[model samples]
Target: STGSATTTPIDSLDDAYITPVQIGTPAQTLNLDFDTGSSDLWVFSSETTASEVDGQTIYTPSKSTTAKLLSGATWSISYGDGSSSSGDVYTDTVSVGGLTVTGQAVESAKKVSSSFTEDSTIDGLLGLAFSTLNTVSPTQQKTFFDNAKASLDSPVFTADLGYHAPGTYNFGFIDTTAYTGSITYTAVSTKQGFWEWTSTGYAVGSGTFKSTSIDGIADTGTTLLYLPATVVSAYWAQVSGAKSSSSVGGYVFPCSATLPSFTFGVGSARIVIPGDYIDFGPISTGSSSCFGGIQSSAGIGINIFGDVALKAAFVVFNGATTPTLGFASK
Candidate 1:
């Protein structure tokens, strides 16, 4: 079977995207962020206190006759941006698009804080990375995709993120019509539990391609693209007045400056990001200073090919017989 879901960008800036997913016996539908960077399908639930709950719709396991508690199992997760949660675990039916999985581990958050609370539109997150990154302890559980892989026609899922419009997430099969040109496949290093790969090179605007190897993860959870300082400076230098700002938390520049397109290699294929995609947006609404979608990965340990880059092309997160990633123009 194949699954498909519409992923709409949240808020005004496309900071993240969310898709509707149904859970439990009666099918409680909620908007979940389809995050490829982490592996834990967690949600805001009835177990959480009112003070921390704020604007999210809670998943009540008691409402589902099929819900079964994974006794003694617990999970806590802290993201790079410091948003975090700890929860009790349960298994229930999870429906995404047209596919359904029974007994899928659903983390019901007992506590939550920070960015999650402020993001009212997303009720939780559905992680698509490897199970190795799952936060559940005592006994780890398979993600919804892992549980449904065997029933799928093919073990693959694809992401099509957009600039200002909504995109889609497709499971078990590739939609040729969804992309343009021939698709290019690359190896995904899964030892670290991420859809990580190395790009052959990069180029700014209409410049010549520089043959270099850059390792990074395809992270849908991240809002920006981060690379080594050397490469970041190279891209920003093309802009007239861009600078790394300690106060702004990353590189920022005059919103009026002309931005350049960013290109990366995958085999002989190239995915080019438009200059506007790199501009991110103003630090504040209509502000003069703007944050860059591409920044330095200095001190972060891992470089990230986040939403900024993913939005440029169609992407496949293949967890088939051998892990691989596919990219194409759209």
Candidate 2:
């Protein structure tokens, strides 16, 4: 059997997408960010301190008759953006679309950073990374996808993230109608608990595609595309008013600047990002400055193909033997 869920983009921010998920018996629904960069199914819960919980919806395990406590087990996670959450563990039935997995480990957040608390709409995160990355102590946990894969008709999922629009996340099978042309497959290195791959190279605007190989991860939770500092510098150099801003901490330019297209290599296929997509809206409300969607991954050590890049194509995350990433034009 197959399952599918709709992903809705947040207004104005355009940084994260969320999907509805049901947890526990007589399930309570929550809007969760399906993140591929990290592994941990966590949610704001009754265990959270009242002071720490704001307008966000909380998950109460006690309300579910089927909920089971994993004694002594605890979890904590910190994101690349510095947002974090920590809490105890519970095992319950979790469902995504029409697919349901029993005995799924669900981390109930007792503490959360202001970044998460302030975003009341997102109830939590559903991690899609390798289960080995799960943070549950005493015993590691499996993600919803990992637990549900065995029952799926095919062990795969597809991400169709749209620009300022709604998309679909399909499980067990790929919908040919969603994409154009054949999918270009690339081998993934899961050693880092991420879908890491090497790009043959990249090009700026209509320029030549260089042979500088770049290693990076495909992360849906991240907002921008990140590359090596030197590569980032090369791209921005072509823009008239582009400059590295100390206050913004990234490359920014006048909103009216004529930005060029950025392309990445996937085998013989070239994935091109339109110039307009690079202008990540105005840097601030009422400001004439705009932040470039591509930034330097200097301190992070690994590059990232976040929403800015992912939204340009239809992506297949194949969890079958020898995990691979398949990309196609949408």
Candidate 3:
């Protein structure tokens, strides 16, 4: 018999911000980063030495009955952003929010980088972002989502990144708890896993301007929001007190009056990023601070809609019988 549980993403309101992810009856807790760039489940291993196990969650293979080790194989994954990991393959009973999949292929990284091993309980990563970026072999096995599709309440799974209090990232069913309005789903472009999108136009402050073109992708793996240089320049032009410094380099503006809301339209859905998200902190150098939300990730070939972007809307990644991304307000 198949069962499921509810997992919530708890916000850490400190310098090293974190979110707690819970699993099962006793609720084995593990801190997770919601990454969209690639697929594959990774966690800190109990087998890891003290030096290696300093600041991460180690997945105890012994905890689950279905856990199995792939004695002869080794696995490695590298991201476009230059982060990578290598580990041994093991299969085990993986559970999340009441949903348990038997014999789930999980990887435990042995030699983790110092960058990843910092002052946080970032045990591992759970890649629920999409299937195109999934590293699993379809011929050999299906993804966690693929494995649990038959048992889900709704074929559609939704993600809600809360703005305040204990924000949550829920799965299994599409529960629109955070939103007071209607949710809309955009059609997935017939391209690939990285949802490459085109902005019909740009809106800065209270005015909407017509741009030649703006292309970006919705990514969950990355932590920063990247935008093209041209779009950045155009966005700053409309804001009267806006000024950018090399320290922050992207979009830094003097905090005088509240700036208008900026949104970009993708087909029928409007991705709105509020002003507060833009102006996150004080500027490094000058008296003026930069807008926190919108910054410059210029020259980066791919624009990653990191956590900053994902937190603003509900993301539905439908990989049940097919692959499609559905976004709505929640």
Best by lDDT: 1
Q: How far is 276's C-alpha from truth in model 1 (Å)?
A: 0.8
Model 1: residues with Cα > 4 Å off, grouped in runs: none
Tens-digit lDDT track of model 2 for 1-330: 678999998766577899999999788898999999999999999999788877877789999988999999999999999889999999999988888899999999999999998888789999999988999998999988899899999999999998889999889999999999999999999999998988889999999999878999999999899999999999999999899998998999998888999999988888888887788878779899999999999988889999888988999999998999999988
**Model-by-model lDDT, in order?**
0.92, 0.91, 0.59
TM-score of 3: 0.80
Clashing pairs in 1: none
lDDT of 1 by residue, 1-330 (tens): 999999999976789999999999788998999999999999999998678877888899999988999999999999877889998999999999989999999999998886788888989999999999999988988888899999999999999998988999999999999999989999999989999999998999999999899999999999899999999999999998899999989999898898999999998899999998987778988899999999999979999999999999999988887899999999
**Best candidate (score: TM-score):** 1
Best-to-worst order by TM-score is 1, 2, 3
| Better candidate by TM-score, 1 or 3 | 1
Candidate 2 yields a Cα-based lDDT of 0.91
